[PDB]
Amino acid sequence: TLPNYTKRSGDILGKIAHLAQIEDDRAAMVISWHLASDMDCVVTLTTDAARAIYDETQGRQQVLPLDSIYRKTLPDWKRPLPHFRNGKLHFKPFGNPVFARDLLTFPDNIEHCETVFGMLLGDTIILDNLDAANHYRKEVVKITHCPTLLTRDGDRIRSNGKFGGLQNKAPPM
Amino acid sequence: NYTKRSGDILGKIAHLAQIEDDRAAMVISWHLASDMDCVVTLTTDAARAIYDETQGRQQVLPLDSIYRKTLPDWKRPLPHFRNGKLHFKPFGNPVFARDLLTFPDNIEHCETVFGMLLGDTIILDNLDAANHYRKEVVKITHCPTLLTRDGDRIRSNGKFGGLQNKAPPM
């Protein structure tokens, strides 16, 4: 619920991802992998602690302060998928794109972690396959910036456009 | 232009576009050199063809999947400006990394691919300035990659620290 400091911050998040009621075991796997793979740093609440850790480690320890992560403004209903330009459909997508966050259902007991998740996950989108993902990005980028894309096949297309390599593939089941 | 060491090529032509600050030049080239351990293609079709034949083992990056900043490109200020207001007084003189490059007439074409690959990356004087910049920028909008003239990187996701994010001595 509260902050858990570890160099293996990903492990904790990947474990919580399997706790939030996810209907697709495939989507469950890639969403947990994506967090576990990215958070190989120490997550702090504030920059002050993140840099204190950084400084004592002579910059050797990777850190990430949550106070340096942009928080979505109140109209989260008014946050549609990037294929919607001005409250209307710009292009027709494939592989059922959906915000990764929108797949999680945090129960009332451990609902205090829904915030940190929605932050760390952000605008990442889950599509069915790489063909769908590849297409989505090509089109989205014609009108706006494109977030990280994860495929239900366990693939990642980084927000910078980079895809491919074993770095961007979730281990089998 | 289709090699695995695409970063090496970019890092080399970074030292060609004359940047006044030798410190800023080092960070900008290191930043591009560190990032591309990937094959850069013009189109997704070729990037995936390379991916497929490699059984997804080779990292790729198609330029047709990069947001090529629209016509009023120059009319876009640093993030400490929003809705036509200076939101805070920043430290360490933030400046778009791209704005430091001056591509000569012979190589006026590589200016495009550079401005794309570099993107909205900002170069500040030091980490203290950068840490502050990000804390404040993120209060109003998304914050790009921050590079310090001391050779430090603060990834767009907020991650800083580790040897992954520090340029080699000189």
Short mmCIF file of all heavy atoms in Angstrom, two decimals, chain A residues 57-120:
data_model
loop_
_atom_site.label_atom_id
_atom_site.label_comp_id
_atom_site.label_asym_id
_atom_site.label_seq_id
_atom_site.Cartn_x
_atom_site.Cartn_y
_atom_site.Cartn_z
N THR A 57 26.05 6.85 -3.44
CA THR A 57 26.41 5.77 -4.34
C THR A 57 27.33 6.30 -5.45
O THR A 57 27.67 5.53 -6.36
CB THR A 57 25.13 5.19 -4.96
OG1 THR A 57 24.14 4.96 -4.01
CG2 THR A 57 25.37 3.89 -5.56
N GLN A 58 27.75 7.59 -5.39
CA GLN A 58 28.57 8.26 -6.43
C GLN A 58 27.91 8.02 -7.81
O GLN A 58 28.54 7.60 -8.77
CB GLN A 58 30.07 7.82 -6.43
CG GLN A 58 30.61 7.10 -5.20
CD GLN A 58 30.75 7.97 -3.98
OE1 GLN A 58 31.06 9.17 -4.05
NE2 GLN A 58 30.55 7.37 -2.81
N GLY A 59 26.60 8.20 -7.84
CA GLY A 59 25.77 8.04 -9.03
C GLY A 59 25.66 6.65 -9.60
O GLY A 59 25.07 6.49 -10.68
N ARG A 60 26.17 5.63 -8.88
CA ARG A 60 26.15 4.25 -9.40
C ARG A 60 24.77 3.56 -9.33
O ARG A 60 24.49 2.71 -10.19
CB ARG A 60 27.25 3.39 -8.74
CG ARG A 60 28.66 3.85 -9.04
CD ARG A 60 29.64 2.87 -8.49
NE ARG A 60 30.71 3.49 -7.70
CZ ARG A 60 30.66 3.67 -6.38
NH1 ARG A 60 29.57 3.36 -5.70
NH2 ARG A 60 31.68 4.23 -5.75
N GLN A 61 23.94 3.92 -8.33
CA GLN A 61 22.61 3.36 -8.12
C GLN A 61 21.56 4.11 -8.94
O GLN A 61 21.44 5.33 -8.80
CB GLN A 61 22.22 3.37 -6.63
CG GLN A 61 20.78 2.93 -6.34
CD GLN A 61 20.53 1.49 -6.68
OE1 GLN A 61 21.07 0.61 -6.03
NE2 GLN A 61 19.71 1.23 -7.70
N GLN A 62 20.77 3.38 -9.75
CA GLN A 62 19.69 4.02 -10.52
C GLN A 62 18.52 4.32 -9.56
O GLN A 62 18.18 3.49 -8.73
CB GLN A 62 19.27 3.16 -11.71
CG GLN A 62 18.36 3.87 -12.72
CD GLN A 62 17.94 2.95 -13.87
OE1 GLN A 62 17.83 1.73 -13.72
NE2 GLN A 62 17.71 3.51 -15.06
N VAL A 63 17.95 5.52 -9.63
CA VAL A 63 16.84 5.97 -8.78
C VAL A 63 15.67 6.54 -9.60
O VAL A 63 15.85 6.89 -10.77
CB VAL A 63 17.29 6.95 -7.68
CG1 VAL A 63 18.17 6.27 -6.67
CG2 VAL A 63 18.00 8.17 -8.25
N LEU A 64 14.49 6.64 -8.98
CA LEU A 64 13.33 7.20 -9.65
C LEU A 64 12.39 7.80 -8.63
O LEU A 64 11.70 7.05 -7.93
CB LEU A 64 12.64 6.17 -10.59
CG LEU A 64 11.18 6.42 -11.05
CD1 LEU A 64 11.05 7.60 -11.97
CD2 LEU A 64 10.64 5.22 -11.76
N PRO A 65 12.35 9.16 -8.51
CA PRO A 65 11.43 9.77 -7.53
C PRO A 65 10.04 9.95 -8.14
O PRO A 65 9.91 10.43 -9.27
CB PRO A 65 12.10 11.10 -7.19
CG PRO A 65 13.03 11.38 -8.32
CD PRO A 65 13.12 10.19 -9.23
N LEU A 66 9.00 9.58 -7.37
CA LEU A 66 7.61 9.70 -7.82
C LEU A 66 7.16 11.16 -7.93
O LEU A 66 6.23 11.44 -8.70
CB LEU A 66 6.67 8.88 -6.95
CG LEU A 66 6.95 7.39 -6.90
CD1 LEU A 66 6.57 6.83 -5.56
CD2 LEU A 66 6.25 6.64 -8.03
N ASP A 67 7.84 12.08 -7.23
CA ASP A 67 7.56 13.51 -7.31
C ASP A 67 8.07 14.12 -8.65
O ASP A 67 7.88 15.33 -8.89
CB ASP A 67 8.09 14.27 -6.07
CG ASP A 67 9.57 14.55 -6.03
OD1 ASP A 67 10.29 14.06 -6.90
OD2 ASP A 67 10.01 15.24 -5.09
N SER A 68 8.73 13.29 -9.50
CA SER A 68 9.24 13.70 -10.80
C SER A 68 8.50 12.96 -11.91
O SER A 68 9.00 12.84 -13.03
CB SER A 68 10.76 13.54 -10.87
OG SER A 68 11.19 12.20 -11.08
N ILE A 69 7.29 12.46 -11.60
CA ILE A 69 6.41 11.76 -12.55
C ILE A 69 5.17 12.62 -12.71
O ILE A 69 4.60 13.02 -11.69
CB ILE A 69 6.10 10.31 -12.08
CG1 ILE A 69 7.32 9.39 -12.27
CG2 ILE A 69 4.88 9.71 -12.80
CD1 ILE A 69 7.36 8.19 -11.36
N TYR A 70 4.78 12.98 -13.96
CA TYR A 70 3.61 13.82 -14.25
C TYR A 70 2.31 13.09 -13.91
O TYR A 70 2.10 11.96 -14.38
CB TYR A 70 3.62 14.34 -15.71
CG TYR A 70 2.33 15.02 -16.14
CD1 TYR A 70 2.05 16.34 -15.78
CD2 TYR A 70 1.37 14.34 -16.88
CE1 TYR A 70 0.86 16.96 -16.14
CE2 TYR A 70 0.17 14.95 -17.26
CZ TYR A 70 -0.08 16.26 -16.89
OH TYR A 70 -1.26 16.87 -17.26
N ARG A 71 1.44 13.73 -13.10
CA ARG A 71 0.17 13.15 -12.67
C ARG A 71 -0.96 13.62 -13.55
O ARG A 71 -1.12 14.83 -13.73
CB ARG A 71 -0.14 13.53 -11.23
CG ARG A 71 0.72 12.81 -10.22
CD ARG A 71 0.99 13.71 -9.03
NE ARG A 71 2.01 13.14 -8.14
CZ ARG A 71 3.33 13.32 -8.28
NH1 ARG A 71 3.80 14.05 -9.28
NH2 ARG A 71 4.17 12.77 -7.42
N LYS A 72 -1.77 12.65 -14.07
CA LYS A 72 -2.96 12.89 -14.91
C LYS A 72 -3.91 13.84 -14.21
O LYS A 72 -4.13 13.71 -13.00
CB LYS A 72 -3.69 11.58 -15.22
CG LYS A 72 -3.32 10.96 -16.56
CD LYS A 72 -3.22 9.43 -16.52
CE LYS A 72 -1.96 8.90 -15.86
NZ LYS A 72 -0.73 9.19 -16.64
N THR A 73 -4.43 14.82 -14.95
CA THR A 73 -5.36 15.79 -14.38
C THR A 73 -6.75 15.12 -14.23
O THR A 73 -7.05 14.16 -14.95
CB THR A 73 -5.32 17.13 -15.13
OG1 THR A 73 -5.44 16.91 -16.54
CG2 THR A 73 -4.04 17.92 -14.84
N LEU A 74 -7.57 15.62 -13.27
CA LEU A 74 -8.91 15.13 -12.89
C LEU A 74 -9.76 14.51 -14.06
O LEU A 74 -10.31 13.44 -13.81
CB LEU A 74 -9.79 16.14 -12.11
CG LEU A 74 -9.36 17.61 -12.00
CD1 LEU A 74 -10.57 18.51 -11.85
CD2 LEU A 74 -8.41 17.83 -10.83
N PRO A 75 -9.90 15.10 -15.30
CA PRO A 75 -10.74 14.43 -16.31
C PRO A 75 -10.10 13.19 -16.96
O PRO A 75 -9.61 13.26 -18.10
CB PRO A 75 -11.07 15.55 -17.30
CG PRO A 75 -9.93 16.48 -17.21
CD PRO A 75 -9.37 16.38 -15.82
N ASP A 76 -10.12 12.05 -16.24
CA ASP A 76 -9.57 10.78 -16.72
C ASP A 76 -10.55 10.02 -17.64
O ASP A 76 -10.13 9.11 -18.36
CB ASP A 76 -9.02 9.90 -15.58
CG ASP A 76 -7.60 10.27 -15.23
OD1 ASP A 76 -6.67 9.70 -15.83
OD2 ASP A 76 -7.41 11.16 -14.37
N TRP A 77 -11.84 10.46 -17.67
CA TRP A 77 -12.87 9.96 -18.59
C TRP A 77 -12.47 10.55 -19.94
O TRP A 77 -12.55 9.89 -20.98
CB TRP A 77 -14.26 10.55 -18.24
CG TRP A 77 -14.78 10.32 -16.86
CD1 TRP A 77 -15.84 9.53 -16.51
CD2 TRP A 77 -14.40 11.03 -15.67
NE1 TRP A 77 -16.10 9.66 -15.17
CE2 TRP A 77 -15.24 10.57 -14.63
CE3 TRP A 77 -13.41 11.99 -15.37
CZ2 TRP A 77 -15.11 11.04 -13.30
CZ3 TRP A 77 -13.29 12.45 -14.07
CH2 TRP A 77 -14.13 11.97 -13.05
N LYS A 78 -12.03 11.84 -19.89
CA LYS A 78 -11.57 12.68 -21.00
C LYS A 78 -10.08 12.42 -21.27
O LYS A 78 -9.29 13.36 -21.40
CB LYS A 78 -11.81 14.18 -20.69
CG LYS A 78 -13.28 14.60 -20.51
CD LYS A 78 -13.41 16.08 -20.19
CE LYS A 78 -14.82 16.48 -19.87
NZ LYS A 78 -14.93 17.93 -19.57
N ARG A 79 -9.71 11.11 -21.32
CA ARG A 79 -8.38 10.60 -21.65
C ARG A 79 -8.64 9.43 -22.61
O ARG A 79 -8.53 8.27 -22.19
CB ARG A 79 -7.57 10.09 -20.41
CG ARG A 79 -7.49 11.01 -19.19
CD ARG A 79 -6.43 12.09 -19.22
NE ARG A 79 -7.03 13.41 -19.02
CZ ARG A 79 -6.37 14.49 -18.61
NH1 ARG A 79 -5.07 14.43 -18.34
NH2 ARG A 79 -7.01 15.65 -18.47
N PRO A 80 -9.07 9.68 -23.86
CA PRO A 80 -9.30 8.54 -24.77
C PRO A 80 -8.00 8.05 -25.41
O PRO A 80 -6.97 8.73 -25.30
CB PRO A 80 -10.28 9.10 -25.80
CG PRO A 80 -10.07 10.58 -25.78
CD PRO A 80 -9.28 10.97 -24.56
N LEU A 81 -8.04 6.88 -26.10
CA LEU A 81 -6.86 6.32 -26.77
C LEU A 81 -6.36 7.30 -27.86
O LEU A 81 -7.18 8.06 -28.37
CB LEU A 81 -7.13 4.91 -27.32
CG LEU A 81 -7.46 3.81 -26.30
CD1 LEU A 81 -8.31 2.74 -26.91
CD2 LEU A 81 -6.21 3.19 -25.73
N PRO A 82 -5.03 7.36 -28.16
CA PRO A 82 -4.53 8.36 -29.12
C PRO A 82 -5.11 8.35 -30.53
O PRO A 82 -4.96 9.36 -31.24
CB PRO A 82 -3.01 8.11 -29.14
CG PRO A 82 -2.84 6.75 -28.59
CD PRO A 82 -3.92 6.59 -27.58
N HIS A 83 -5.82 7.27 -30.94
CA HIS A 83 -6.43 7.22 -32.27
C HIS A 83 -7.68 8.10 -32.39
O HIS A 83 -8.27 8.18 -33.47
CB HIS A 83 -6.69 5.78 -32.73
CG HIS A 83 -7.69 5.02 -31.93
ND1 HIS A 83 -7.36 4.43 -30.74
CD2 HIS A 83 -8.96 4.70 -32.24
CE1 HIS A 83 -8.44 3.80 -30.34
NE2 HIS A 83 -9.44 3.93 -31.21
N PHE A 84 -8.06 8.79 -31.29
CA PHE A 84 -9.17 9.75 -31.24
C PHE A 84 -8.57 11.15 -31.19
O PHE A 84 -7.89 11.50 -30.21
CB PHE A 84 -10.07 9.50 -30.03
CG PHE A 84 -10.88 8.24 -30.11
CD1 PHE A 84 -10.62 7.17 -29.28
CD2 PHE A 84 -11.95 8.14 -31.01
CE1 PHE A 84 -11.39 6.00 -29.35
CE2 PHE A 84 -12.71 6.97 -31.08
CZ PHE A 84 -12.42 5.91 -30.25
N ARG A 85 -8.79 11.93 -32.26
CA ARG A 85 -8.25 13.28 -32.43
C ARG A 85 -8.98 14.30 -31.57
O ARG A 85 -8.46 14.69 -30.52
CB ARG A 85 -8.21 13.67 -33.93
CG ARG A 85 -7.54 15.02 -34.28
CD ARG A 85 -6.04 14.95 -34.52
NE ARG A 85 -5.28 15.03 -33.27
CZ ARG A 85 -4.29 15.89 -33.03
NH1 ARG A 85 -3.93 16.76 -33.96
NH2 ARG A 85 -3.66 15.88 -31.86
N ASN A 86 -10.18 14.73 -32.02
CA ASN A 86 -10.97 15.75 -31.32
C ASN A 86 -12.36 15.22 -30.90
O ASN A 86 -13.40 15.76 -31.30
CB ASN A 86 -11.05 17.04 -32.18
CG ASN A 86 -9.72 17.54 -32.74
OD1 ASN A 86 -8.76 17.81 -32.00
ND2 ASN A 86 -9.65 17.69 -34.05
N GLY A 87 -12.35 14.15 -30.09
CA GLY A 87 -13.55 13.46 -29.61
C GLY A 87 -14.28 12.73 -30.72
O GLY A 87 -15.50 12.52 -30.64
N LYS A 88 -13.52 12.36 -31.78
CA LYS A 88 -13.95 11.65 -32.99
C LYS A 88 -12.81 10.74 -33.46
O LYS A 88 -11.64 11.03 -33.15
CB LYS A 88 -14.35 12.66 -34.09
CG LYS A 88 -15.69 13.35 -33.84
CD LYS A 88 -15.86 14.64 -34.63
CE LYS A 88 -17.17 15.33 -34.35
NZ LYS A 88 -18.33 14.54 -34.84
N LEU A 89 -13.13 9.65 -34.18
CA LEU A 89 -12.16 8.65 -34.66
C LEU A 89 -11.33 9.12 -35.88
O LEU A 89 -11.88 9.35 -36.97
CB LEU A 89 -12.86 7.30 -34.94
CG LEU A 89 -11.93 6.12 -35.24
CD1 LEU A 89 -12.05 5.05 -34.19
CD2 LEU A 89 -12.21 5.57 -36.61
N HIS A 90 -10.00 9.22 -35.66
CA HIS A 90 -9.02 9.65 -36.67
C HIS A 90 -8.65 8.53 -37.64
O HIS A 90 -8.57 8.79 -38.84
CB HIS A 90 -7.76 10.25 -36.00
CG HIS A 90 -7.00 11.17 -36.90
ND1 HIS A 90 -6.28 10.69 -37.98
CD2 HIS A 90 -6.90 12.52 -36.87
CE1 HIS A 90 -5.77 11.76 -38.57
NE2 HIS A 90 -6.11 12.88 -37.94
N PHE A 91 -8.40 7.32 -37.12
CA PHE A 91 -8.06 6.12 -37.90
C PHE A 91 -8.64 4.85 -37.23
O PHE A 91 -8.89 4.86 -36.02
CB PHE A 91 -6.55 6.00 -38.15
CG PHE A 91 -5.69 5.69 -36.95
CD1 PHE A 91 -5.44 4.37 -36.56
CD2 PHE A 91 -5.10 6.71 -36.22
CE1 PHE A 91 -4.67 4.09 -35.44
CE2 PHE A 91 -4.29 6.42 -35.12
CZ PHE A 91 -4.08 5.11 -34.74
N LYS A 92 -8.86 3.77 -38.02
CA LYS A 92 -9.42 2.53 -37.50
C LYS A 92 -8.32 1.56 -37.05
O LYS A 92 -7.55 1.09 -37.89
CB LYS A 92 -10.41 1.91 -38.49
CG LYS A 92 -11.87 2.16 -38.09
CD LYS A 92 -12.77 2.72 -39.22
CE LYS A 92 -14.17 3.05 -38.73
NZ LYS A 92 -15.08 3.49 -39.83
N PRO A 93 -8.18 1.31 -35.71
CA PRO A 93 -7.09 0.44 -35.24
C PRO A 93 -7.41 -1.05 -35.24
O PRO A 93 -8.57 -1.45 -35.32
CB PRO A 93 -6.83 0.96 -33.82
CG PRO A 93 -8.16 1.44 -33.35
CD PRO A 93 -8.98 1.82 -34.58
N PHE A 94 -6.36 -1.88 -35.13
CA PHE A 94 -6.49 -3.33 -35.08
C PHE A 94 -5.96 -3.83 -33.73
O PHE A 94 -5.30 -3.08 -33.01
CB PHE A 94 -5.73 -4.01 -36.24
CG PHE A 94 -6.03 -3.50 -37.64
CD1 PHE A 94 -5.02 -2.94 -38.41
CD2 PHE A 94 -7.32 -3.58 -38.17
CE1 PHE A 94 -5.30 -2.48 -39.71
CE2 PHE A 94 -7.59 -3.11 -39.47
CZ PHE A 94 -6.58 -2.58 -40.23
N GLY A 95 -6.27 -5.09 -33.40
CA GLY A 95 -5.82 -5.76 -32.19
C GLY A 95 -6.32 -5.20 -30.88
O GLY A 95 -5.65 -5.31 -29.86
N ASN A 96 -7.52 -4.60 -30.91
CA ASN A 96 -8.21 -4.03 -29.75
C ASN A 96 -7.28 -3.27 -28.78
O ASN A 96 -6.98 -3.80 -27.70
CB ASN A 96 -9.03 -5.08 -29.01
CG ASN A 96 -9.63 -6.12 -29.91
OD1 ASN A 96 -10.53 -5.87 -30.70
ND2 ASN A 96 -9.10 -7.33 -29.80
N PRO A 97 -6.81 -2.05 -29.14
CA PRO A 97 -5.98 -1.29 -28.21
C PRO A 97 -6.79 -0.87 -26.99
O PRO A 97 -8.00 -0.62 -27.11
CB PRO A 97 -5.53 -0.08 -29.04
CG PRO A 97 -6.55 0.10 -30.06
CD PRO A 97 -7.08 -1.27 -30.38
N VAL A 98 -6.15 -0.88 -25.82
CA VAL A 98 -6.75 -0.53 -24.53
C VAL A 98 -5.66 -0.07 -23.57
O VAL A 98 -4.57 -0.66 -23.59
CB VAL A 98 -7.62 -1.69 -23.95
CG1 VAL A 98 -6.87 -3.03 -23.96
CG2 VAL A 98 -8.15 -1.37 -22.56
N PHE A 99 -5.93 0.99 -22.77
CA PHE A 99 -4.95 1.46 -21.79
C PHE A 99 -4.67 0.36 -20.80
O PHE A 99 -5.61 -0.28 -20.32
CB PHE A 99 -5.41 2.75 -21.09
CG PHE A 99 -5.20 4.00 -21.92
CD1 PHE A 99 -6.27 4.77 -22.33
CD2 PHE A 99 -3.91 4.42 -22.26
CE1 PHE A 99 -6.08 5.95 -23.06
CE2 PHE A 99 -3.72 5.59 -23.01
CZ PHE A 99 -4.81 6.34 -23.40
N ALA A 100 -3.37 0.06 -20.59
CA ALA A 100 -2.92 -1.01 -19.70
C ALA A 100 -3.59 -0.88 -18.34
O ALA A 100 -4.13 -1.87 -17.83
CB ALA A 100 -1.41 -0.97 -19.56
N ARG A 101 -3.61 0.36 -17.80
CA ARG A 101 -4.22 0.72 -16.52
C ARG A 101 -5.68 0.31 -16.44
O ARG A 101 -6.10 -0.21 -15.42
CB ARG A 101 -4.03 2.22 -16.21
CG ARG A 101 -4.50 3.17 -17.31
CD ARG A 101 -4.56 4.61 -16.85
NE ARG A 101 -5.28 5.43 -17.83
CZ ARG A 101 -4.70 6.31 -18.63
NH1 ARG A 101 -3.39 6.51 -18.58
NH2 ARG A 101 -5.43 7.01 -19.49
N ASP A 102 -6.44 0.49 -17.53
CA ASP A 102 -7.86 0.16 -17.62
C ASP A 102 -8.16 -1.33 -17.47
O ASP A 102 -9.33 -1.68 -17.33
CB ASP A 102 -8.48 0.73 -18.91
CG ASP A 102 -8.55 2.25 -18.99
OD1 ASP A 102 -8.49 2.91 -17.92
OD2 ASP A 102 -8.69 2.77 -20.11
N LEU A 103 -7.14 -2.20 -17.46
CA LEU A 103 -7.32 -3.64 -17.29
C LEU A 103 -7.22 -4.06 -15.83
O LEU A 103 -7.67 -5.16 -15.47
CB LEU A 103 -6.31 -4.43 -18.13
CG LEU A 103 -6.75 -4.71 -19.54
CD1 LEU A 103 -6.26 -3.65 -20.47
CD2 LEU A 103 -6.28 -6.07 -19.99
N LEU A 104 -6.65 -3.20 -14.99
CA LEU A 104 -6.48 -3.46 -13.57
C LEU A 104 -7.73 -3.05 -12.78
O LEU A 104 -8.32 -2.00 -13.04
CB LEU A 104 -5.27 -2.70 -13.01
CG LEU A 104 -3.99 -2.74 -13.80
CD1 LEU A 104 -3.16 -1.54 -13.49
CD2 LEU A 104 -3.23 -4.02 -13.53
N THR A 105 -8.10 -3.88 -11.81
CA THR A 105 -9.22 -3.61 -10.94
C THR A 105 -8.70 -3.83 -9.52
O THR A 105 -8.64 -4.97 -9.04
CB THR A 105 -10.46 -4.45 -11.33
OG1 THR A 105 -10.59 -4.49 -12.75
CG2 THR A 105 -11.74 -3.92 -10.72
N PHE A 106 -8.23 -2.75 -8.88
CA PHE A 106 -7.67 -2.80 -7.54
C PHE A 106 -8.76 -2.92 -6.48
O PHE A 106 -9.60 -2.02 -6.38
CB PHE A 106 -6.79 -1.59 -7.24
CG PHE A 106 -5.41 -1.69 -7.82
CD1 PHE A 106 -5.12 -1.16 -9.08
CD2 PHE A 106 -4.39 -2.32 -7.12
CE1 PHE A 106 -3.84 -1.26 -9.62
CE2 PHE A 106 -3.10 -2.41 -7.66
CZ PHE A 106 -2.84 -1.88 -8.91
N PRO A 107 -8.75 -4.01 -5.68
CA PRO A 107 -9.80 -4.14 -4.64
C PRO A 107 -9.66 -3.09 -3.53
O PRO A 107 -8.57 -2.53 -3.37
CB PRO A 107 -9.65 -5.57 -4.14
CG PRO A 107 -8.23 -5.95 -4.47
CD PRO A 107 -7.82 -5.16 -5.68
N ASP A 108 -10.75 -2.82 -2.80
CA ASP A 108 -10.84 -1.82 -1.72
C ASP A 108 -9.76 -1.95 -0.61
O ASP A 108 -9.30 -0.92 -0.10
CB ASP A 108 -12.25 -1.83 -1.13
CG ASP A 108 -13.25 -1.04 -1.97
OD1 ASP A 108 -13.80 -1.62 -2.95
OD2 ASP A 108 -13.48 0.14 -1.67
N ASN A 109 -9.32 -3.20 -0.28
CA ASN A 109 -8.29 -3.48 0.73
C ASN A 109 -6.89 -2.91 0.36
O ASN A 109 -6.22 -2.33 1.23
CB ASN A 109 -8.22 -5.00 1.04
CG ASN A 109 -7.48 -5.85 0.01
OD1 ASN A 109 -7.62 -5.70 -1.21
ND2 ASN A 109 -6.64 -6.75 0.50
N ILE A 110 -6.46 -3.13 -0.92
CA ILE A 110 -5.19 -2.65 -1.50
C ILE A 110 -5.54 -1.83 -2.77
O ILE A 110 -5.35 -2.27 -3.91
CB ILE A 110 -4.14 -3.79 -1.77
CG1 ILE A 110 -4.14 -4.91 -0.68
CG2 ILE A 110 -2.72 -3.21 -1.98
CD1 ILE A 110 -3.72 -4.58 0.83
N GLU A 111 -6.13 -0.64 -2.53
CA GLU A 111 -6.57 0.35 -3.52
C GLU A 111 -5.64 1.57 -3.42
O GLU A 111 -5.70 2.46 -4.27
CB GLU A 111 -8.03 0.74 -3.21
CG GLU A 111 -8.74 1.58 -4.27
CD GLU A 111 -8.84 3.06 -3.94
OE1 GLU A 111 -9.40 3.40 -2.87
OE2 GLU A 111 -8.36 3.87 -4.76
N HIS A 112 -4.77 1.59 -2.40
CA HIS A 112 -3.81 2.65 -2.11
C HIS A 112 -2.61 2.65 -3.08
O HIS A 112 -1.89 3.65 -3.16
CB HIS A 112 -3.34 2.53 -0.65
CG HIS A 112 -4.48 2.35 0.33
ND1 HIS A 112 -5.08 1.12 0.52
CD2 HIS A 112 -5.11 3.27 1.10
CE1 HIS A 112 -6.04 1.31 1.41
NE2 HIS A 112 -6.09 2.59 1.80
N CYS A 113 -2.45 1.54 -3.85
CA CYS A 113 -1.41 1.26 -4.85
C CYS A 113 -1.88 1.48 -6.30
O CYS A 113 -1.08 1.40 -7.23
CB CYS A 113 -0.84 -0.14 -4.64
SG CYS A 113 0.57 -0.21 -3.51
N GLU A 114 -3.18 1.79 -6.47
CA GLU A 114 -3.81 2.09 -7.76
C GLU A 114 -3.20 3.37 -8.35
O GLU A 114 -3.04 3.48 -9.56
CB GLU A 114 -5.33 2.25 -7.58
CG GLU A 114 -6.14 2.40 -8.85
CD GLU A 114 -7.65 2.50 -8.64
OE1 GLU A 114 -8.11 3.46 -7.99
OE2 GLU A 114 -8.36 1.60 -9.15
N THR A 115 -2.85 4.34 -7.46
CA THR A 115 -2.26 5.62 -7.84
C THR A 115 -0.87 5.43 -8.41
O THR A 115 -0.65 5.81 -9.56
CB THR A 115 -2.28 6.62 -6.68
OG1 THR A 115 -3.51 6.51 -5.95
CG2 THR A 115 -2.06 8.05 -7.15
N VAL A 116 0.06 4.82 -7.63
CA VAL A 116 1.46 4.57 -8.03
C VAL A 116 1.54 3.72 -9.33
O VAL A 116 2.41 3.96 -10.17
CB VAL A 116 2.30 3.99 -6.86
CG1 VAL A 116 1.85 2.59 -6.45
CG2 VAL A 116 3.80 4.02 -7.16
N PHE A 117 0.58 2.80 -9.50
CA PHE A 117 0.47 1.94 -10.67
C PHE A 117 0.10 2.75 -11.89
O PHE A 117 0.84 2.72 -12.86
CB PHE A 117 -0.57 0.85 -10.42
CG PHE A 117 0.07 -0.50 -10.31
CD1 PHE A 117 0.81 -0.84 -9.19
CD2 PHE A 117 -0.01 -1.41 -11.36
CE1 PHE A 117 1.43 -2.09 -9.10
CE2 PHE A 117 0.60 -2.66 -11.26
CZ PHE A 117 1.31 -2.99 -10.13
N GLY A 118 -0.99 3.52 -11.79
CA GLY A 118 -1.48 4.39 -12.85
C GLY A 118 -0.44 5.39 -13.32
O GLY A 118 -0.48 5.83 -14.47
N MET A 119 0.52 5.72 -12.41
CA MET A 119 1.64 6.63 -12.64
C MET A 119 2.73 5.92 -13.40
O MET A 119 3.09 6.37 -14.49
CB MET A 119 2.24 7.11 -11.31
CG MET A 119 1.43 8.16 -10.61
SD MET A 119 2.43 8.77 -9.07
CE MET A 119 0.97 9.76 -8.16
N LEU A 120 3.26 4.82 -12.82
CA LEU A 120 4.34 4.01 -13.38
C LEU A 120 3.98 3.35 -14.72
O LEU A 120 4.84 3.24 -15.60
CB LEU A 120 4.83 2.98 -12.36
CG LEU A 120 5.63 3.56 -11.21
CD1 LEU A 120 5.64 2.65 -10.06
CD2 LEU A 120 7.07 3.86 -11.61
#
